[PDB]
Every structure is written in structure tokens, then in C-alpha cells.
Amino acid sequence: VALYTVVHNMSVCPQRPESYCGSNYCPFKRVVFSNCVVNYTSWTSGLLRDYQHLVLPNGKFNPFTECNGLNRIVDDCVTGFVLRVGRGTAVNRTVITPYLKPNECFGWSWNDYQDSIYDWWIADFVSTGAFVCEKNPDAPRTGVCITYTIEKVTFQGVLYESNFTFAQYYNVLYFGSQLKYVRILGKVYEVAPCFEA
Amino acid sequence: CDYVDFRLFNGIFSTSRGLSNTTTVITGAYPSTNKAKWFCPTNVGRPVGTGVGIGVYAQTAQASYETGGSGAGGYTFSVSPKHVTNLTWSLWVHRPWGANANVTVRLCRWWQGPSSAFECLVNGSFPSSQHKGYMFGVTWYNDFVRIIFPPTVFELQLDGLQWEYVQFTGPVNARMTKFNVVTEISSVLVLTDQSGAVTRYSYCADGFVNGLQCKLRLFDIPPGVYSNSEVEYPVALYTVVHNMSVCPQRPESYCGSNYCPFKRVVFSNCVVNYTSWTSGLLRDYQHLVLPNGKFNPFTECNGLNRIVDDCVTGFVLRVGRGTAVNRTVITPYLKPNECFGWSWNDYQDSIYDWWIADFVSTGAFVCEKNPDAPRTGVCITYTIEKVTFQGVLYESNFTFAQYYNVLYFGSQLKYVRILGKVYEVAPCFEASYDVLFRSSSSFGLLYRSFDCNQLRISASRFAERLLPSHNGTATALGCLFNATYAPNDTMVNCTNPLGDGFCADLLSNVVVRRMTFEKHDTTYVAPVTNERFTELPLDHQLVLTEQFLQTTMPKFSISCET
Amino acid sequence: YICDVSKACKNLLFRYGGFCQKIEADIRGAGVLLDSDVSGLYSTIAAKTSSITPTTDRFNVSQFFLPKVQSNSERFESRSVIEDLLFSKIETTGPGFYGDYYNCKKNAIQDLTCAQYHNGILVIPPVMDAETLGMYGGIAAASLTLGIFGGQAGITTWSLAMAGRLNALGVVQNALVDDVNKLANGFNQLTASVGKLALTTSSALQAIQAVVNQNAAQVESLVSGITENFGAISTNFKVISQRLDKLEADVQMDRLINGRMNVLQLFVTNYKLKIAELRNTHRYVQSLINECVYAQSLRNGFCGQGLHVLSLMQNAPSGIMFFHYSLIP
Amino acid sequence: LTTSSALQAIQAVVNQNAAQVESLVSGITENFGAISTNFKVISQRLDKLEADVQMDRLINGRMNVLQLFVTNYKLKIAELRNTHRYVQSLINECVYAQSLRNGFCGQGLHVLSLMQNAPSGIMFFHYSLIP
Ligand SMILES: *[C@@H]1O[C@H](CO)[C@@H](O[C@@H]2O[C@H](CO)[C@@H](O)[C@H](O)[C@H]2NC(C)=O)[C@H](O)[C@H]1NC(C)=O
Ligand SMILES: *[C@@H]1O[C@H](CO)[C@@H](O[C@@H]2O[C@H](CO)[C@@H](O)[C@H](O)[C@H]2NC(C)=O)[C@H](O)[C@H]1NC(C)=O
Ligand SMILES: *[C@@H]1O[C@H](CO)[C@@H](O[C@@H]2O[C@H](CO)[C@@H](O)[C@H](O)[C@H]2NC(C)=O)[C@H](O)[C@H]1NC(C)=O
Ligand SMILES: *[C@@H]1O[C@H](CO)[C@@H](O[C@@H]2O[C@H](CO)[C@@H](O)[C@H](O)[C@H]2NC(C)=O)[C@H](O)[C@H]1NC(C)=O
Ligand SMILES: *[C@@H]1O[C@H](CO)[C@@H](O[C@@H]2O[C@H](CO)[C@@H](O)[C@H](O)[C@H]2NC(C)=O)[C@H](O)[C@H]1NC(C)=O
Ligand SMILES: *[C@@H]1O[C@H](CO)[C@@H](O[C@@H]2O[C@H](CO)[C@@H](O)[C@H](O)[C@H]2NC(C)=O)[C@H](O)[C@H]1NC(C)=O
Ligand SMILES: *[C@@H]1O[C@H](CO)[C@@H](O)[C@H](O)[C@H]1NC(C)=O
Ligand SMILES: *[C@@H]1O[C@H](CO)[C@@H](O)[C@H](O)[C@H]1NC(C)=O
Ligand SMILES: *[C@@H]1O[C@H](CO)[C@@H](O)[C@H](O)[C@H]1NC(C)=O
Ligand SMILES: *[C@@H]1O[C@H](CO)[C@@H](O)[C@H](O)[C@H]1NC(C)=O
Ligand SMILES: *[C@@H]1O[C@H](CO)[C@@H](O)[C@H](O)[C@H]1NC(C)=O
Ligand SMILES: *[C@@H]1O[C@H](CO)[C@@H](O)[C@H](O)[C@H]1NC(C)=O
Ligand SMILES: *[C@@H]1O[C@H](CO)[C@@H](O)[C@H](O)[C@H]1NC(C)=O
Ligand SMILES: *[C@@H]1O[C@H](CO)[C@@H](O)[C@H](O)[C@H]1NC(C)=O
Ligand SMILES: *[C@@H]1O[C@H](CO)[C@@H](O)[C@H](O)[C@H]1NC(C)=O
């Protein structure tokens, strides 16, 4: 198998909004994450003792501790989200999960551990059509039969490099109801049937 | 506007997938093909145009070979709700004067296009096309923002946005950037080329023939008989049909001397004033005002829509009182089918009232107004007692039992009761018609379920329903309009059958004739038992008759897990 | 039928794997097969008469099988006396849309349309529609004489035609006037006994009622498919999206769309199942017209048991009734 | 094609076969309301309750299309059982013999009948003398 959540290159994501509210009470700072490549461990300070609770058993950083309607474990690509940040104080080392609306995920790491100060972030996954991944896609292996998934549609077949051109707004091209051409990383591939299945 | 380039519409149409040489219907918020809906006046200054709707589109003028040089056009425009406060989101889009200019797009909350805002979701600058004519747009139908500067499309759903009001300016050069505010959702038939790009469109509602083009997925319609074109009629919802009295008051939140449980009151079968649940001073409830200026009782729901659109089911309401630390009211744990809201009680001391509404099964409804009497004698798609039906209401002297609001005969809805008065439900027979089509300038109409005798269409019963096309010929096939009806002529060669032994002759003009069949003979000869006359043939015609019979199919093997 | 005026529902229909394209291709192709069969039937029915009409002497065939002559009233009737009795002995199915449809076909009022439209569904007549025609009149008239007078005309009377038929069946060598009158009395008593057929005793009236009862049960299914809510809070789509949140509005709209898809799909399957039966029923019907009605057959038991004298045919509700006359010992 | 009712009967079979094939092609292209047609995608992005709701939407959507194909295929087989008995009677009695049955090999006095293969079936050519 070969999944493509996206087929083009994405640029990097913005930074996490800063949690320090200046002099008074202020509302939170929202930033849209969409169509970009994200480094989730940039959202912490970087010292291991601040984010140990976010490390998965396989040694991987995970941004979230609790979700409503989604999987808290992030497997390399999610949809686009709106991210808001804030800051609190834990009593007896216990961060309380707040009320989560549907399609929201919560996470936190220590900011000033001795003073029990933490940053938190809530990601609200709204309809965007775009995706946030942790890496860019690769070029396909041509000339072998693979079960692909491209543009939410699964098909079994063989890709060959092609000199065909179709319009730049599309990433797949149909002839009637038959998938004939796809575009991956700017290059166009003819979809051929694997007759020996 | 004087000239809108309608060949630039091809670049803003797209399908979901890439389709080679196909013909398909797409649907969405699209620019009007009526040139009077566009805005491009030349004057001494830059004129400010406004509009109300769901979107906007724009075309820049042809820059190459126009004696312009470098000045192009700025097209500053903003989109906003009906009541702009500190708390509402708005859009601001600006291009500066000159070529190689960057469009700036800003979706922010401004306290005052201003420089400083509280926060922004889109704060972006990017290059644009100026070497040719260029078309772009921004739509916000059902709060789904779509920013279409081709080739890229930026999309974002933002609930409760409620954008409706559009303002736009443009500096006159030499012309001006043209503007069209979109008011409604359209269907468009499109034709693609080999590469999937749209090369031919046609809007489904620009005319009579255009609707038939979209029904058949064809641009060039050959002559024929095309059945079941339908007429759309407006809607009328009745969540209730009787008058309700007023609701009780909100329970008071002041607990007397000690700790006490909350006070519950049932709201059911009544008319509610939600802004009575606050103190009435605006600074206490500003967070409950929607962007359209409307009061909304709730800030958070579990399983329901927090925006209340004029009627909900009955609920049990409990109140209470708390203290906010650093002006932050915390939403508590909400059981399913519950909604939460709050307003300030003593703002300086940070004291607030709250209320939780638990929508339990009651069978009854809480509305913000009483229903109205129906408009009789027009075909409306009604919804009454959770059942949707299309039809016509007439006042009636019929009586049925007071426990019921609808009355069925078998499975047919015959009578309803609205505000104590009983109405007969009648069918609107003119909702469906066929087209007896020669070309775009010669067609006839057949209303197959409509008996249009002159007594019926002249009555006061049919006064509000009479269109000019209902004055046709009453046939056994229905009402035939602007076709001639000739049931004494015959045709043995019928290419266009209508049913019931009728045929449509579509050669010169639209005529309805009768079908016939060629009479055959038999080979059985009766025996000759006495002297009489008999009829013998003189010669014979040799005849070839063909007969097809299907005998085979391919076999299938199915792996249903695969 | 699914999404009555709701534009929000129509934007959701593309998700289902070509449902609405496949429905409209199946119901249209089935009517093409229906029109192809009914057209072949009426080119078989249409047949030449003699230019001199023979006289029925004592055989009362014109009073029963031939269209009723227009009386002193401007109410034209195309049906015979037998064809009227077959429409009027079929029981009603009660109030509703189909009972309104049957009574329009039964009453046969001139220039009155019987087509109905409900909820996106048009009821169109077929290419000929037997239910408004008399068998032995009209443009596509059947021959009354072709199977006992034959295809070479000249036999002057029904008494001379029946005498030759009794001779060819080997029961009388040369039929006298008492032999032919005995056959004319037995014909007229049997034909008058058709007007006393009850539904409880007649297996031909029972076969018509079974068709009429299956049509009403199918119509109630389409009426119930847009009346009930399948578990959603309303049949109004805009109501559903306004009162619920996004997850529960998408669950309940999926309940309405699938509930209406299942009822509509079941109608198309039953309609295709009835077309497929009628392909080989029509070939059987064309053989009865060609070999029993318009000729004299040699096949034992094919036109009834016994020695075959005459066969006639009449229109019925949704079909044709064959009247076979035989001599059994 | 516009004038020949035998060519029209062949085209009706060929048009019904294409419409059935598009139904099987569309049944694995569309997502029936789920977020993807990839099952591993669905279980990775959603929680346990919503992953089981959306997988049930794909499985039932594909089950309905596949089941409809088998029903239509069985409906066509059941028609062809009694069509074959009619076809065997035309070969035995019109093509390989001389029949006595009025109108069974066409109307009129029967001279000759021949048969040819067609797309998905057989075409009979009946030659007759009518006066
Ligand atoms: C993702 O973010 C982490 C956290 O900042 C980056 O790790 C740091 O990278 C810099 C390189 O400029 C090093 O000097 C630091 O020692 C790294 N660790 C910490 C804790 O700051 C990392 O480079 C980013 N990118 C990737 C691909 O992981
Ligand atoms: C909308 O926001 C403006 C600016 O944030 C508010 O104006 C301030 O009002 C306070 C009094 O409430 C003054 O002390 C400040 O000097 C004002 N200006 C600024 C720049 O802060 C305004 O009151 C708000 N309006 C509403 C209705 O909330
Ligand atoms: C939106 O973007 C503009 C720049 O594209 C921001 O303007 C800058 O803001 C910073 C911080 O206040 C100033 O130091 C710069 O002088 C500004 N101008 C520039 C870079 O030309 C603007 O602040 C952004 N808006 C928000 C709400 O962040
Ligand atoms: C709904 O409740 C509001 C809030 O009390 C009512 O508004 C007040 O009406 C009285 C009339 O007796 C006025 O004197 C007040 O000035 C109004 N405003 C406030 C803030 O108290 C309103 O009348 C009620 N009814 C409707 C239909 O809105
Ligand atoms: C429908 O059309 C008919 C035919 O034009 C109208 O009947 C004519 O009405 C006029 C009144 O202006 C009379 O003077 C004529 O004698 C009528 N008969 C003809 C012209 O043959 C009828 O009025 C129209 N009805 C409606 C409701 O539009
Ligand atoms: C067959 O038709 C003849 C027509 O001549 C019928 O005979 C007449 O019937 C009417 C109706 O009852 C009587 O009033 C006449 O007295 C009859 N006349 C003669 C000469 O018979 C006859 O009744 C018909 N037979 C059947 C069984 O319907
Ligand atoms: C916190 O810890 C102290 C002692 O460590 C304990 O007495 C107290 O109950 C804990 N909880 C809170 C909410 O203070
Ligand atoms: C594509 O174009 C190049 C350049 O002419 C050619 O060498 C090659 O054969 C073409 N086809 C493919 C499949 O690469
Ligand atoms: C996509 O990203 C990779 C990252 O290394 C880069 O090397 C490549 O040039 C980019 N563009 C294309 C078209 O692959
Ligand atoms: C305009 O955009 C280009 C490309 O994004 C950028 O290099 C340039 O600095 C921008 N100039 C201004 C004035 O915004
Ligand atoms: C369809 O595309 C083909 C090439 O794939 C080309 O002949 C032409 O552009 C189109 N032809 C027709 C008949 O639409
Ligand atoms: C409230 O505000 C003060 C200063 O304004 C701040 O120090 C404190 O962390 C805030 N939060 C709480 C829970 O007290
Ligand atoms: C109802 O009754 C009144 C009073 O007799 C009468 O005038 C009217 O015609 C009746 N029918 C309708 C439909 O109002
Ligand atoms: C219903 O309420 C309206 C409110 O103005 C009132 O005028 C009317 O009399 C009431 N009753 C009926 C039967 O409409
Ligand atoms: C029957 O009509 C069609 C179309 O009008 C025509 O092409 C054909 O030649 C006609 N045939 C006869 C025999 O009239």
C-alpha cells in the first residue's frame, strides 16, 4: 500500500502563539495551521523535564493528552486546525483538562516547573480542506502494482511517468469513470492496470 | 456596468475531480450573468458601491494594449456582519496602485482599513495576475469562507460568522475593477476540454431552455419529448399551529442565607422572551449578542445547535450564581441535550448569573413568536406536524376532532387545522410539465396531470394560480399549450410517442396526432362447403422481418471481501 | 423524492455511489421495454376485416363483444358490455391515490387526464393503453371474423361459418338449421352467464384482483416512504440542521436519505421484476391471438380442452381476457 | 438505429449493461459520508465511537451496491430461462423445419428462416409472402 494524504510540497507551519499575556487580562491568541509541515516539539521549551508526559511509549513526541471525537495519538497527518494557547497554575502538580467542544484536542507542557506554571494549547479542527503533516510526500515507485490512496480514493494499479498534461487545479484526471492520470510532486503519472492480480 | 468579459468566467469554475471531455452540473455561489448586477461607473473620483449577499466577484480590466502603462486598480473591499462590534470578525482586502502589486487580505477583529486589531486569522500578502484580464472572488455561504484567487483557493469554516454586507471602492484609470455581489446559490452546466478545463458554461436559471439543458446534461438539444420538468414553490414551516401563551419568568439566582439546591422551572408550549433572562443593561450581556444584532441565550451546547433559530423543544431550566476569576466564566460539565449561558449580575464584583437548559422529551415547543395564518390559493411546500407536503390550502367548513391538527383519508392528507381554522389540502396539478421540443424558438408544453377546462381556470379558486401557459387545450393527456391538437389525423410512422395512442409530429410545427398500426391478414383459409364468392390474391409481396432475442451474458466471479 | 426542495440535501446525494443516476437509468429503460412489447402486441391485434360485413343471425356476438352504440346522450363510450362488467366487478382498494387512479380508468370520461404527479413521480400512460380502448373498435381494431371466416372472405353469415366449423371438427357432416341453432343457444346462454360472475367463484376475476391488489400495496409503500421520519426529528432538512449540532445533524440526515433511498429502490426492483415476467407473457399472448383467435389450431388443449369452436378477446383492467368456446363430450 | 426495432432491441441491452457497470464503479469511488475510502485512515484520525460509525457507513454503502448487482443479475437469468425455451422452439420449428403455426415465423406464408449471431444473442431473419 501507499497512502498520499497530500501530493504536493508544503512549506513550514507558523510558530505556536506565545502564552504570556502582557499586563492585564486578555483573550487568547489564535493562529491557523493549514497546508504546512509541523514540528510539534517546537511547541514546548525543549527541556525534557517539561514535556515527559507527552512522550509516547515508542519514544515519539505527541502534542495532545485528550481529544473530543478524534484520536489523541497523531499518526503523521491531520486536517487543518485553529490553535489557541494560554497559561495556568497547577495545584499539587495536577493539570485539569477543561471542557472540550467536539473536534478539539488538548495538550500542555511545563513552563516554570518549580512555580507550577504551564502552557496549554487547544486545537480546534475546523473544515479547511487542507492538511497538516509532519513530512512531505515522496515520489512513487513506478512499474510495480501498488494499492494507492490518492485524493481520498483507493485504487490498485501501476504508475508510469508520462508526458501528458492536465490543468493545475486538479491532481487526478478521469476519462468517464476511469482514473487515467494523477499528479504527484508536480509530475504526471499514467495509471495502468495490473492484469496479473 | 457597460462591458463584463463573460469569457473570464471559465477560470473560476471547477469540479471536484479532473474530468476529461465531460458535461456535468456544478452548484455553488457564482457570479451573475446579468450585466446590470455588475458595478463599474466612471466618474471624477472613485465611487463606493455596496451590496448585501453571500459573496462577491471581481474582474480587472484588460491591461495589455489599453494605454494604461503601470496603473491597474486598487479594488479595496470589505465584508462585515450587520452589527460590527469589538467582538465580530470582518474581512478587508486591498490592492495598491500599480503593476507588480501584492494583494493584502485581512480577516481580523478591529476596535476601529485600520492598522491595529485585536487578532487576525488571515494576515497575508501575495502577488496577483495583471498581464491579462483576471477574475477572483470571496464567498461566505453558510459561514464557510472561500478565498478564490486562481490558481489557489483558501478555505476555512468559521461558525457564527454571519457576513452579509459588502462595500467596495475602485480607482478610475484611463477603466475600473468591476464588482458583483452574489445573492444566491446557482446551478451551472459546464463542458470541459481534454485537460479538464471548463470551456463552455450555461446557467440553469437564465431561461426556459437553460433549465432543460441542465435537466438533460446537453448543450445542443435534439428534437424530442422530454418529460417531468418541475416547478419549484416556496416553503412554509409550522413548528406549531396553535397560539401559545407567555412563558414563566427565569428562576431567581439569589440563594437566601445558606447553601441551597438550584431552582428548576419547566418551559413548554409557550412564547419566550430570552433577553428577559438578563438584567437589561447592555454591558452585562454583550457576549450573548450575535453578529446579526440578535440576542442568543446560549454560549455552549452538548448535542444541540447553540444558535437558536426561533423554535426549540421544551426544556427544564435551572439557574445559579458564581464568581469569575480574571473575567473568565468557566463552562461546567454538560450532559447530552444541555445548553449553557450566562450574563453579568454585578460586573464590578465579577458576579454572574448562569442558566442550564436540559431539553427533555415533552412533545411541546418553545418559540419566540406565534404562527400566522396561511396564504390560501397558492402552491406551497408546507411542513405541518413534522410531515412535509406540497399543496394548496383552501378555507373549509369541514370539522374534525379537536385533539388532531391533521386529518388523513387512508394515506392521503385531506385537512389540516391552523390557528383554529380548518383548511382543505388540494393538489397543485401544475407542478409538472413536459416539453414537446423542436428548437429553442418552437416548443409546446404538456401539463400531464392538469385538466384545464375553462370552468376551472376561470373560477376564483384558480385566480392566484393562473399563469399564461395554463390556457391551453384539454386533452386526454392533460393540458396542451401552444401546440395544435388534431385527434382525427393519423400517423403510422411515429417517432415521438406521447402515450395513449397519441404522437407528436415535430417536423414543421408542434402537432399532436393519433397513432395507427398496419393491418395484417392470416393464413388460415376457411373451408369451402357450398358455391359462393371468395377473395383470392393476385400476387404476393416478399417480406423480411427481423427478430432479436437475448441469449447470453458473461459469467461473474466475485470476491466480496475484496 | 429524496430531498424535496432542500438544497442542502441535494449537495449530499453525490456521496452515495451513483444511486440517483442508476435509478433514472433503470426506470427509463424498463419503460422502453414496456413500450417495445405493447407496440408488438398492437401490430398483432390490428387486422383486416371483410369489406362486406357478415350478418350474425342468432349468435349475439355484437351485443356483448362489440362497442356500445352512442345513445341519445353526448357521452361517448368505446367499451363493449363485457368490457364494462370486467371493470365494475373489481373491488376497490379504499381511499388513496391508486383508488383515485383506478376510478378514473373505470369511469373513462372523454378528454379527462388520469395522470398524477406526487413528490417527483409522474404516472404516464404507455404507448397504447388498453384501458381506454374497446377491442373491436377504434383505430387499432381487432378483427371479429378472421378466425372462423378465415383470410379469404365470402362466407355470408355466421350460420354458414359455424356449419363449416362443425363439419371440420367432425361432429356433423352437413349441419342443418337445428344443429346450428343448438350451437347458437349454447353460445348465447354462456355469454349471458359472464354477467353473473362473482369474484369468489371466478378464477379469471381473481387473477385481475390480484394484479389490482399488488398495485395498491406498492403505492402505499411510496406514500409511506415520504410520510415517516425513519428516526430523525423531522422530515424537514432545514429543521434538522438548525436544531442539532454538526455530528448529530449528519447522523439524522443519513437516516432520512437512506430510508427514502431504500423505499424508492425497492419500487424500481419490483417494477423491473414485473417487466421481466411480461416479456415472455407477451410472446404467449401473441401466440394465443395468432393461433386461437385469428386461425384454427391443431394443438391439443392450447385453446382450452376439447374441440375448439371459437375464441374471442376483450380488454380487462391491465390486460386481456380470452373467451374460449369448446365442445367436450 | 432510429428506424429498426431489432437494432433498438440490441441497443437497449447494451445500454443496460453500461448503466450497471457504472454502478459498480461508483460504489467504490464514493465515500458514502465517511472521511476516506481508506479504512486505516479512518481508525487513525477518529476516536473509537466515530471510527465505528463511519466504517459502518462504508461497509453498508458498498454492500448495497454489490447486493443490487446480484439481484439485477438474478433477475436477468430468470427472464432468460423462458426466453431460451422460446428460442429453441424458433430453431426447431422455423429454421430446421416447416411450421404449421399461423404467425409464429412472421405473418404470411413462410418461405425461409435463417439465423445470425448478434451482440449478446441471436437474430432470426424470417422471409414470408403476404398478398
Ligand atoms: C524541531 O524542533 C526542535 C525543538 O526546537 C528542534 O531541536 C533543536 O534544534 C536546534 C537546531 O537549531 C538544536 O540546536 C537544539 O539542540 C535542538 N533541541 C532543542 C531541545 O532545542 C529541531 O531541530 C526541529 N526540527 C526537527 C526536524 O526536529
Ligand atoms: C470596544 O473597544 C474599545 C477599545 O478596546 C473600547 O474603548 C475603550 O473604553 C475604555 C472604557 O471602557 C476606555 O477607558 C479606553 O480609553 C477606550 N479605548 C481604548 C483604546 O482602550 C470600547 O469601550 C469597547 N466598546 C465596547 C462596547 O465594548
Ligand atoms: C499583520 O501583518 C503586518 C505585516 O504584514 C503586521 O504589521 C507589523 O506589525 C509589527 C508588530 O506590531 C510591527 O513591528 C511592524 O512595523 C508592522 N509592519 C510591517 C512589518 O510592515 C501586523 O501587526 C499584523 N497584524 C497582527 C494582528 O499581527
Ligand atoms: C422582552 O424583554 C425586554 C427586557 O425586559 C423588554 O424590554 C423592556 O421593555 C420595557 C417595557 O415595559 C421598557 O420599559 C424597557 O426599556 C425595555 N428594555 C429593558 C432593557 O428593560 C421587552 O419589552 C420584552 N418584550 C419584547 C417583545 O421584546
Ligand atoms: C383563455 O383563452 C381563450 C381564448 O383566447 C379566452 O377566451 C376568449 O375570451 C375573450 C375575452 O377577452 C372573449 O371575448 C372571446 O370570445 C374568447 N374566445 C375566443 C377568442 O375564442 C379566455 O378568456 C382565456 N382565459 C384566461 C383565463 O386567460
Ligand atoms: C339474443 O339476441 C336476441 C335479439 O334478437 C334477444 O331476443 C330479444 O331479447 C329482448 C330482450 O329481452 C326481448 O325483449 C325480445 O323479446 C327478444 N326477441 C326475440 C325474437 O328473441 C335474445 O334475448 C338474446 N339472447 C340472449 C341469451 O341474450
Ligand atoms: C494539595 O496538597 C496538600 C498537601 O500536600 C493537601 O492537604 C491538599 O488537600 C491538596 N489539594 C488541594 C486542592 O489543595
Ligand atoms: C516524453 O518526452 C521525451 C522527450 O521527447 C521522450 O524522450 C519520451 O520518450 C516521452 N515519453 C515518456 C513516456 O517519457
Ligand atoms: C519538494 O520537497 C523536496 C524536499 O527535499 C525538494 O527536494 C523538492 O525539490 C521539492 N519539489 C519537488 C517538485 O519535488
Ligand atoms: C510583494 O510580494 C513579493 C513576493 O511575495 C515580495 O517579494 C515583495 O517583497 C512584496 N512587496 C511588497 C511591497 O509587499
Ligand atoms: C476528447 O479528448 C480527445 C483526446 O483525449 C480529443 O479528441 C478531443 O479533445 C475530445 N474529443 C471529443 C469528441 O470530445
Ligand atoms: C489572574 O490575574 C493575575 C494578575 O492579573 C495573575 O497573576 C493570575 O495568574 C491570574 N489567574 C489566576 C487563576 O489567579
Ligand atoms: C361555508 O359556509 C358558509 C356559510 O353557509 C358558506 O357561505 C360557504 O360557501 C361555505 N363554504 C366555504 C368553502 O366557505
Ligand atoms: C392568536 O394570537 C393572535 C396574536 O395577535 C391573536 O390576535 C388571535 O386572536 C389569536 N387567536 C387566533 C384564533 O388566531
Ligand atoms: C419514418 O420516419 C422517419 C423519421 O421521420 C424517416 O426517417 C423514415 O424514412 C420514415 N419511414 C417511412 C417508411 O415512412
Author numbering:
A (entry chain A): 265 to 461
B (entry chain C): 17 to 128, 142 to 203, 205 to 592
C (entry chain B): 593 to 921
D (entry chain C): 791 to 921
List sentences from the manuscript:
The spike glycoprotein of coronaviruses mediates viral entry by binding host receptor with the S1 subunit and fusing viral and cellular membranes with the S2 subunit, thereby determining viral host range and tissue tropism. As a class I viral fusion protein, the spike exists on the envelope of virion as a homotrimer and each monomer contains more than 1000 amino acid residues that can be cleaved into S1 and S2 subunits. In this study, we report the cryo-EM structures of the SADS-CoV and HKU2 spike trimers at 2.83 and 2.38 Å resolution, respectively. The overall structures of HKU2 and SADS-CoV spikes we determined here resemble the previously reported prefusion structures of coronaviruses spikes. Both spike trimers have a mushroom-like shape (~150 Å in height and ~115 Å in width), consisting of a cap mainly formed by β-sheets of the S1 subunit, a central stalk mainly formed by α-helices of the S2 subunit, and a root formed by twisted β-sheets and loops of the S2 subunit.
The HKU2 spike trimer structure is the first one from bat coronavirus. The atomic-resolution density map enabled us to build nearly all residues of HKU2 spike ectodomains (residues 17–995) except for a few breaks (residues 129–141 and 203–205), as well as 48 N-linked glycans and 71 water molecules. The NTD of HKU2 has three layers of antiparallel β-sheet with the top one consisting of six strands, the middle one consisting of five strands, and the bottom one consisting of three strands. The CTD of HKU2 has a twisted five-stranded antiparallel β-sheet as the core with connecting loops between the strands. Interestingly, the CTD core of HKU2 is of high structural similarity with the conserved CTD core of β-coronaviruses and the disulfide bonds in the CTD of HKU2 except for C285–C290 are also detected in all β-coronavirus CTDs. The HKU2 S1 subunit, similar to those in α-coronaviruses HCoV-NL63, HCoV-229E, and PEDV and δ-coronavirus PdCoV, has an inward CTD that contacts with the NTD. The FP and CR, which are often not well and totally resolved in other coronavirus spike structures, can be clearly modeled in the HKU2 spike due to the atomic resolution of the map. In HKU2, the second helix is replaced by a short strand (713–716) and the third helix is replaced by a loop (721–741), therefore there are two short strands and only one helix in HKU2 CR. The S2′ cleavage site (between R671 and S672) is then covered by the reversed CR helix and loops, and R671 interacts with E723 in the loop and K697 and K698 in helix 1. The buried S2′ site indicates that HKU2 spike, compared with other coronavirus spikes, would require more conformational changes around the S2′ site for the exposure.
